[PDB]
Design a protein around this ligand. Structure first.
Ligand SMILES: Nc1ncnc2c1ncn2[C@@H]1O[C@H](COP(=O)(O)OP(=O)(O)NP(=O)(O)O)[C@@H](O)[C@H]1O
Ligand SMILES: Cc1ccc2c(c1)C(=O)[C@]1(O)CCN(c3ccccc3)C1=N2
Ligand SMILES: [Mg+2]
Length: 706
């Protein structure tokens, strides 16, 4: 049994190494220790001091450099006896304080033990290197094991959810939180791997298709940002579906709004979506001539950020892997070829250069890029040129050809690019779901992988929606861990004094999405239909409603175009430029009419299939992106409320994507804003189990521990 064999790989990579006689000596020491700050300006930098004396209310301890200091017992962060260092479940610690919890994660992380329980939920600290704990042999070890029978692991919480699903006949979710780069997408994939394996299984083709969906989604929906070389730029909820017997019967991917803006613009050092680099690196021979391709430096949409490759990644090899996944999932050769024509066409569109005509209207003097795009998309270049520079609109009921200047023509060309790419992405997910989901499900385990909290030098509308999604997820953790839990204790009247755990994201949520008094998204929508609005009237309206009024909002003194939201994970300043256009998300109807006539069978579907190309109305206006965002988030939250949730908190070790480098302030900020210590305390002080060290409740008896 590998669990008990100290030579096994399980022991070697998932268990705390045996300590030596010198460590034994230290472990039976009668000395006692304290975690203190050498510099009180930096509360997160701790050293260990020996406690050398005490009074009824203070400790005196030695500092690393010697000099003795005193501290009130009520302010003291005592160090755990060292037999606790490496403990698998931190609810076992005697002293529950910040430096002690960090220390335990630190000891485990120093020996590549990245998973640790923190009471009821799992903490996963990103190793930023490969650790061989996800093999089939590891999978087989965890299969069917109760949590306290095996070491902490993403496989274990996955098995727990799978047995709860069987035993309780109840849908489950696995909610994996974390800032950008923390490990959500990798851990998501391990949960899927594990479930596909243990739920069977000779009848392996579906399981393979499920796994192969990922390189396709990542190639199109992930990109290098400053926070993650493989940042997810869309959120997803993956439903792994099981028949009533408990075997996997299918899967279905719910994808959320994609950051289409990245197709046309990337900040310094970032990349566009991986697929563009994969194509240009990995085509073939006649693909490059058939698609009129050259290198990334030759395309405006890839030559701006100064970064065309990612250390340790071969875009040409990844292209082979993406195509191989497209084959396995079932995309035809003609379908793959049309997918790449659309990628190539986008890049050609981005190389159109509009310039000033005799008058204010733009003209196109060099049509090389226009012609190449039109060739690959299968559209008429003269019709496309006219739809870009001279689109027709109604003015009242009259039909009037506009003549757009350079800036507007360029923006319209970008709008067409973003629509093509976002619609292609939706089409990819739809095609995948049609393959993966071929049976009605009895049960599901849903795994949520959102885009993680992020802060850049410039934060725009996309960042506010990403960070709001993260705030809402933290609140769902707070609701589950603290608020519902104490609501039960009351509904049962069990002698329980309510405890304020001081974690409540409600104020920030009402600021962003309040109705009600109206929050930020509601005012954005109101401005979006006001004929006379500008990004400046919008910011003025926000300040008017919130400045010196809402405690989570800040009107900054250093800028007239930004506002601050105090999120659970820190304040973010948001630049208002282009918000009304991003929210309206316009696309000239003459461009749509041009692409509806495409000779290409995939392009034609992107523009004629209503599930892909149609947009809902609200009154006399198309539904705004903020409204679409809210519908998606509301649908997710409604789904989660039907499941029994399991939480995995991914923690990034530093801001440099490096292994073996824990950064104290970075880690501790996450431990605080994630509510990890509060989560351990409720576990310890509360009454985790109730049917039908104790309380007799009105209709159940509640159990502690044990
Ligand atoms: N358990 C792991 N083993 C090995 N490498 C990992 C692990 N978890 C994370 N990584 C590395 O860390 C990188 C970022 O992790 P990822 O799971 O993509 O982050 P994320 O939380 O999904 N970020 P985002 O999509 O931007 O919100 C990965 O590409 C891997 O290099
Ligand atoms: C549950 C949910 C709902 C909406 C979402 C997300 C998740 C995301 O993670 C994103 O898919 C990440 C990008 N993003 C987005 C992009 C542009 C505009 C608004 C949101 C997101 N919206
Ligand atoms: Mg991700």
């Amino acid at each position: 049994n590998p669990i008990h064999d100290r030579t096994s790989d399980y022991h070697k990579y998932l268990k705390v190494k045996q300590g030596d006689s010198d460590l034994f000596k230290l472990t039976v020491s009668d000395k006692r220790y304290i975690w203190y700050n050498p510099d009180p300006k930096e509360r997160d930098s701790y050293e260990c001091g020996e406690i050398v004396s005490e009074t009824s209310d203070s400790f005196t301890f030695k500092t690393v450099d010697g000099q003795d200091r005193q501290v009130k017992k009520d302010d003291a962060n005592q160090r755990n006896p060292i037999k606790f260092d490496g403990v698998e479940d931190m609810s076992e610690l005697s002293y529950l304080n910040e430096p002690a919890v960090f220390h335990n994660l630190r000891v485990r992380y120093n020996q590549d033990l990245i998973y640790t329980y923190s009471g009821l939920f799992l903490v996963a600290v990103n190793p930023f290197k490969r650790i061989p704990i996800y093999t089939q042999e590891m999978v087989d070890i965890f299969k069917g094991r109760r949590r306290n029978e095996v070491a902490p692991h993403i496989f274990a919480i996955s098995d727990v959810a799978y047995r709860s699903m069987l035993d309780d006949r109840q849908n489950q979710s696995l909610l994996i939180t974390g800032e950008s780069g923390a490990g959500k997408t990798e851990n998501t994939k391990k949960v899927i791997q594990y479930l596909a394996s243990v739920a069977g299984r000779n009848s392996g083709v579906l399981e393979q298709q499920i796994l192969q969906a990922n390189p396709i989604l990542e190639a199109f929906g992930n990109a290098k940002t400053t926070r993650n070389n493989n940042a997810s730029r869309f959120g997803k909820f993956i439903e792994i579906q099981f028949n009533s017997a408990g075997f996997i019967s299918g899967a279905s991917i719910q994808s959320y709004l994609l950051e289409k803006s990245r197709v046309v613009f990337q900040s310094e050092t970032e990349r566009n979506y991986h697929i563009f680099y994969q194509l240009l690196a990995g085509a073939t021979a006649e693909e490059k001539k058939a698609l009129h391709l050259a290198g990334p430096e030759s395309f405006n949409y890839l030559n701006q950020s100064g970064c065309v490759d990612i250390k340790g990644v071969s875009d040409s090899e990844e292209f082979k892997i993406t195509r191989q996944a497209m084959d396995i999932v079932g995309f035809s050769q003609e379908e793959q070829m049309s997918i790449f024509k659309i990628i190539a066409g986008i890049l050609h569109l981005g190389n159109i250069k509009f310039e000033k005509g005799a008058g204010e209207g733009a003209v196109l003097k060099d049509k090389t890029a226009l012609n190449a795009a039109s060739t690959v998309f299968g559209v008429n270049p003269s019709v496309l040129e006219k739809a870009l520079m001279e689109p027709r609109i109604l003015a009242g009921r009259d039909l009037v050809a506009q003549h757009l200047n350079v800036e507007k023509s360029s923006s319209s060309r970008d709008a067409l690019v973003k629509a093509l790419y976002g619609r292609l992405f939706l089409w990819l997910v739809k095609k995948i779901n049609n393959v993966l989901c071929q049976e009605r499900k009895a049960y599901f385990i849903g795994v949520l992988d959102i885009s993680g909290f992020e802060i850049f030098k410039v934060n725009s509308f996309e960042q506010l929606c990403i960070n709001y999604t993260n705030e809402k997820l933290q609140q769902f953790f707070n609701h589950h861990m603290f608020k519902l839990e104490q609501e039960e204790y009351l509904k049962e009247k069990i002698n329980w004094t309510f405890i304020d755990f001081g974690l409540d994201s409600q104020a920030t949520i009402d600021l962003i999405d309040g109705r009600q008094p109206p929050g930020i998204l509601a005012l954005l929508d109101e401005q979006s239909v006001f004929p006379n609005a500008t990004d400046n009237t919008l910011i003025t309206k926000l300040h008017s409603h919130f400045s010196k009024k809402n405690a989570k909002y800040e009107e900054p003194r250093f800028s007239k175009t930004e506002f601050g939201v105090t999120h659970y994970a820190g304040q973010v300043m948001y630049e208002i430029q282009d918000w009304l256009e991003k929210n309206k998300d316009p696309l000239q109807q003459d461009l749509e009419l041009c692409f509806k006539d495409s000779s290409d069978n995939v392009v034609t579907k992107l523009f004629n299939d209503p599930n892909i190309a149609s947009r809902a109305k609200k009154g006399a206006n198309f539904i705004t992106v903020a409204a679409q965002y809210k519908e998606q988030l509301a649908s997710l939250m409604a789904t989660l409320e039907t499941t029994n949730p399991h939480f995995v908190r991914c923690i990034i070790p530093n801001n440099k994507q490096l292994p073996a480098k824990l950064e104290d302030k970075v880690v501790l900020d996450q431990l605080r804003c994630n509510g990890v210590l509060e989560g351990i305390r409720i576990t310890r002080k509360g009454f985790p189990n109730r049917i039908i060290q104790y309380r007799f409740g009105i209709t159940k008896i509640f159990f502690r521990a044990g």
